[PDB]
Design a protein around this nucleic acid. Structure first.
Length: 136
RNA sequence: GUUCUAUUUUGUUGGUUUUCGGAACUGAGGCCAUGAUUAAGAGGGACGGCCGGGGGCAUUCGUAUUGCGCCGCUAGAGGUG
C-alpha cells in the first residue's frame, strides 16, 4: 500500500495473465516473477449466474475491479499474457479476453507488451471424446 | 598291335600258322572354315553414386495432461443450450 516510485520519472510494472476459457475468464495480476500475486477476480465473482461468466460484461466488471484494486496499490503499467484453455482442447481464447483488455485500457492501465502464454502442446495425449467426438 | 570266327584253297584222306573277310579292346597320326548366332526397350547378378515418415535395436529431446513438495491472494472452480 506504499509505493517508493516517483510520479514523473517512471512507471511500476506488473503482469496480468488473462485466461480466456469458453466458460469463465481469469484476470490475474502478479509481479515480474509471477510468484507474488496482487489481485484475481473473475466474471463469476461479479455476475451470479453461471451462463454469462465468460460474457464481455462480466469480463469488463472483472477488469474494472482488478484495475481498481491495482490503483489501490499504485502499479501503473501491466504486461499482458493471454492464455486460452490450451492442451489437447481448444486454443482460441474466449470472448472475454478482448473485452477485459479494452476495459483495463479504458480504465487507465499502461499497456506494456502483449504476448501469448497459451499452453500449446507439442504432441498431446488423447482428446476428451470418443472416436466420433462430441456430437450434438 | 591283342582276342574270337564263318571259311574259298594245298587233285581226294589227318594237325598248326597265315594271304583273304567279319565283331570287340588299344596306339601314332592326316583333315574339319576344327565346334559356343545375338544378348530381347525379357529376367537375374556384380559395380558406382544418390534417395527414401521402409525394418529392427540402443540412445536422446520436446511439450501437454495428471499427481506431489514450497510460496502469494481470494470464494469460488469444472461443465452445459
Amino acid at each position: 500500500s506504499l509505493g517508493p516510485q516517483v510520479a514523473e520519472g517512471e512507471n511500476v510494472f506488473g503482469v496480468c495473465h488473462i485466461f480466456a476459457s469458453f466458460n469463465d475468464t481469469f484476470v490475474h495480476v502478479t509481479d515480474l516473477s509471477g510468484k507474488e500475486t496482487i489481485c484475481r477476480v473473475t466474471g463469476g465473482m461479479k455476475v451470479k449466474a453461471d451462463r454469462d461468466e465468460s460474457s464481455p460484461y462480466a469480463a469488463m466488471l472483472a477488469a474494472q475491479d482488478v484495475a481498481q484494486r491495482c490503483k489501490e496499490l499504485g502499479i501503473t503499467a501491466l504486461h499482458i499474457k493471454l492464455r486460452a484453455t490450451g492442451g489437447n482442447r481448444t486454443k482460441t481464447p474466449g470472448p472475454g479476453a478482448q473485452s477485459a483488455l479494452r476495459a483495463l485500457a479504458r480504465s487507465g492501465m499502461k499497456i506494456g507488451r502483449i504476448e501469448d502464454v497459451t499452453p500449446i502442446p507439442s504432441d498431446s495425449t488423447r482428446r476428451k471424446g470418443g472416436r466420433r467426438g462430441r456430437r450434438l
